[PDB]
Amino acid sequence: NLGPKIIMLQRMMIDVFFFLFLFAVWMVAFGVARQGILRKNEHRWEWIFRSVIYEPYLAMFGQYPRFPEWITIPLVCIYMLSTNILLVNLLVAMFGYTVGSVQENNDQV
Amino acid sequence: PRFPEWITIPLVCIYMLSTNILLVNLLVAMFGYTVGSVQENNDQV
Amino acid sequence: LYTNNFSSLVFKNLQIAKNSYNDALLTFVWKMVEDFRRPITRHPLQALFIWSVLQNKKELSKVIWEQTRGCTLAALGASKLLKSMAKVKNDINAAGESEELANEYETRAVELFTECYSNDEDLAEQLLTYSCEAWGGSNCLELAVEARDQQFIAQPGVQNFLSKQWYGEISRDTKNWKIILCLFFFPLIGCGFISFRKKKLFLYYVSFFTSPFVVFSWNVIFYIAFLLLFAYVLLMDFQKEPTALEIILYVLVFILLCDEVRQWYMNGSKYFSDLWNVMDTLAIFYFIAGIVFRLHSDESSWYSGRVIFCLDYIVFTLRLIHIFTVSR
Amino acid sequence: DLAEQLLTYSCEAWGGSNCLELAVEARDQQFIAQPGVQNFLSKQWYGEISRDTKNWKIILCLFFFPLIGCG
Amino acid sequence: WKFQRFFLVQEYCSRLTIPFPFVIFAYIFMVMRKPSVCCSRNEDNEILAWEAVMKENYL
Amino acid sequence: TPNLVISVTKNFALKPRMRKIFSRLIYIAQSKGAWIFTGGTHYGLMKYIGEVVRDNTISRSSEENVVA
Numbered sequence: 005n006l007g008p009k010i011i012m013l014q015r016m017m018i019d020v021f022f023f024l025f026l027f028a029v030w031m032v033a034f035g036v037a038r039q040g041i042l043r044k045n046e047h048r049w050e051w052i053f054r055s056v057i058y059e060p061y062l063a064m065f066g067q068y069p070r071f072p073e074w075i076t077i078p079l080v081c082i083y084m085l086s087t088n089i090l091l092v093n094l095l096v097a098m099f100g101y102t103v104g105s106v107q108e109n110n111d112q113v
Numbered sequence: 114p115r116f117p118e119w120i121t122i123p124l125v126c127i128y129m130l131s132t133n134i135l136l137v138n139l140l141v142a143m144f145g146y147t148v149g150s151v152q153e154n155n156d157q158v
Numbered sequence: 159l160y161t162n163n164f165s166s167l168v169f170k171n172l173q174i175a176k177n178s179y180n181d182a183l184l185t186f187v188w189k190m191v192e193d194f195r196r197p198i199t200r201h202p203l204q205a206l207f208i209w210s211v212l213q214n215k216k217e218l219s220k221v222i223w224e225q226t227r228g229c230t231l232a233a234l235g236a237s238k239l240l241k242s243m244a245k246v247k248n249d250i251n252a253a254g255e256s257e258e259l260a261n262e263y264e265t266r267a268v269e270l271f272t273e274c275y276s277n278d279e280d281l282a283e284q285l286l287t288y289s290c291e292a293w294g295g296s297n298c299l300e301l302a303v304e305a306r307d308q309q310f311i312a313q314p315g316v317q318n319f320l321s322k323q324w325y326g327e328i329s330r331d332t333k334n335w336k337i338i339l340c341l342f343f344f345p346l347i348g349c350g351f352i353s354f355r356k357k358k359l360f361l362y363y364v365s366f367f368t369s370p371f372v373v374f375s376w377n378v379i380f381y382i383a384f385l386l387l388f389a390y391v392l393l394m395d396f397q398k399e400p401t402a403l404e405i406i407l408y409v410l411v412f413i414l415l416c417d418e419v420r421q422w423y424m425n426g427s428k429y430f431s432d433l434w435n436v437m438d439t440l441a442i443f444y445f446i447a448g449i450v451f452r453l454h455s456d457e458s459s460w461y462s463g464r465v466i467f468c469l470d471y472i473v474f475t476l477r478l479i480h481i482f483t484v485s486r
Numbered sequence: 487d488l489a490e491q492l493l494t495y496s497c498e499a500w501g502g503s504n505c506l507e508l509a510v511e512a513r514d515q516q517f518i519a520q521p522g523v524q525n526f527l528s529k530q531w532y533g534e535i536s537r538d539t540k541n542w543k544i545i546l547c548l549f550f551f552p553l554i555g556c557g
Numbered sequence: 558w559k560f561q562r563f564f565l566v567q568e569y570c571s572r573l574t575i576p577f578p579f580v581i582f583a584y585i586f587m588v589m590r591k592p593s594v595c596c597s598r599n600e601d602n603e604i605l606a607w608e609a610v611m612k613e614n615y616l
Numbered sequence: 617t618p619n620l621v622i623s624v625t626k627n628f629a630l631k632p633r634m635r636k637i638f639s640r641l642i643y644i645a646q647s648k649g650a651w652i653f654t655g656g657t658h659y660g661l662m663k664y665i666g667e668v669v670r671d672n673t674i675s676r677s678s679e680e681n682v683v684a
Contacts, residue, residue: 009148016137056389061121075462082473200594224616228605367575424571
């Protein structure tokens with residue numbers, strides 16, 4: 005890609021890295037919520053780390069939260085909000101490289 | 114590939130890195146056509 | 159001037175503008191016009207300038223604008239008033255001319271303020287916040303924000319004034335990490351690791367903690383600590399009778415409630431315009447419901463309260479992510 | 487007032503067509519895009535209802551019959 | 558975007574008073590706690606005089 | 617006194633340019649350091665000179681001053 009696309013390529017890697025960072029942050033909270041709702045007996049400090057950290061990734065892609073029927077709708081709304089934020093961040097990562105630059109002197113950069 | 118429970122987190126990080134590179138390449142493929150051209154004389158091409 | 163030589167058409171149009179596009183300045187102007195139409199006013203030259211402007215007399219308004227005492231403020235207010243006048247669709251031809259005149263005056267005001275700032279920086283900022291009763295108790299910044307003229311705010315001088323207000327007594331040019339390291343460690347500020355902008359010593363410690371930048375960063379750090387506490391308590395500190403730890407958590411949440419009430423009281427109209435503020439408030443109310451369940455001390459309600467707490471935790475994390483996104 | 491009366495004017499010199507009818511078939515964007523015709527069209531769209539009334543005012547009157555009478 | 562940033566920063570600057578954990582104190586304190594002419598004052602006159610001179614140069 | 621000016625003027629109406637000329641004169645007197653001489657204070661041209669002096673001091677202040 006070395007040529008007139010290198011500025012575009014360099015900004016986008018950073019933006020996508022930030023998006024992945026936000027996604028990880030969100031996954032931690034999702035896992036904590038799921039672990040808290042489902043399991044109660046388990047108080048071992050060792051198992052909690054396993055659960056909260058790498059249960060959700062297994063749930064997405066792995067071999068391994070609706071127990072309650074009454075709070076389904078608020079959960080759906082929460083899902084919608086998270087979708088909104090993360091999709092916005094991804095699209096900003098996509099389209100960030102255009103705003104700062106100027107078309108007239110793009111070649112020198 | 115999850116036989117081992119102990120190296121799950123580094124595997125997750127590796128997945129994240131591969132995702133980063135491949136998504137970058139796809140988006141560059143999407144938006145490549147715009148940089149080279151000039152708006153004034155686009156018709157002749 | 160106001161009873162006889164004031165065009166009836168412009169009066170009828172002004173009426174609509176007062177009725178349906180009501181603004182803080184546009185009610186004071188209407189009151190003055192009505193009082194004249196019926197000692198009465200100070201700042202006579204402002205009254206004559208408004209009379210000239212409302213009839214869209216460009217040259218005769220520019221002439222009288224020079225004799226006025228507060229030039230930049232008068233021009234900004236005239237632009238605002240013309241903006242309000244232009245939003246009336248009863249008459250289109252007049253509205254177009256009014257908008258053109260508004261743009262002219264806005265450009266003139268920004269140019270004049272640049273000229274003023276070039277000579278002396280200290281006096282320009284004192285002038286900027288200056289307020290006169292000639293208008294509705296409004297200063298240049300307050301008038302610019304309501305007028306929604308992007309150029310005046312976008313110019314360098316006001317931006318620098320705002321930036322050094324944001325940093326406060328903290329000296330600029332100090333790299334951010336320097337500030338954060340001083341934030342974690344109390345002693346450093348005293349030694350001279352962080353500079354300052356200008357019995358004596360104590361003011362450094364006080365002013366380091368009243369600057370908005372420091373407070374904002376500290377609040378974010380403490381919010382992360384709060385989320386960690388929340389997670390720990392929820393996962394392995396939930397018992398039949400709430401423990402002291404949960405009580406500390408509840409106290410923190412109540413602090414947050416008061417902070418939200420301040421936003422309700424200070425600016426009510428625009429606070430509910432956006433979804434994210436609504437979500438924060440609904441999250442705190444959700445928490446309240448969760449306590450209501452927890453206190454019943456029945457297992458069936460206990461489990462439901464626990465679930466409520468988990469969902470509220472997710473919502474709080476979403477709030478934090480929103481903060482990070484916009485901050486970056 | 488007279489410009490709008492002129493606008494809809496029709497003459498047999500052409501095929502029974504007025505200025506608006508001719509502009510639409512001619513597909514000249516500028517003539518339609520200009521302010522005056524836009525204002526004429528907008529106040530045709532609103533009708534005898536006075537403009538500058540905020541939309542919610544109209545909707546509230548729509549739900550409740552009596553309000554329109556009061557003012 | 559410069560205007561938008563000014564607006565958001567102004568809002569935040571107005572909001573922030575002190576570090577979050579101690580905030581309540583101030584609030585409590587605040588609740589316990591709770592005729593100037595435009596141009597009569599001389600120090601106010603000086604600023605307007607300077608502004609008028611600046612305008613003459615601009616003209 | 618590096619350089620001192622004297623002017624003799626008795627009412628007179630200022631013209632659009634005369635004001636520029638005399639403002640420039642006073643600015644130069646400020647730049648070099650000078651004494652100006654005027655007769656009395658009968659308002660007119662000399663009063664305008666006084667006004668220009670008063671404007672200049674607040675406009676600049678800093679180093680040096682002018683004397684009427």
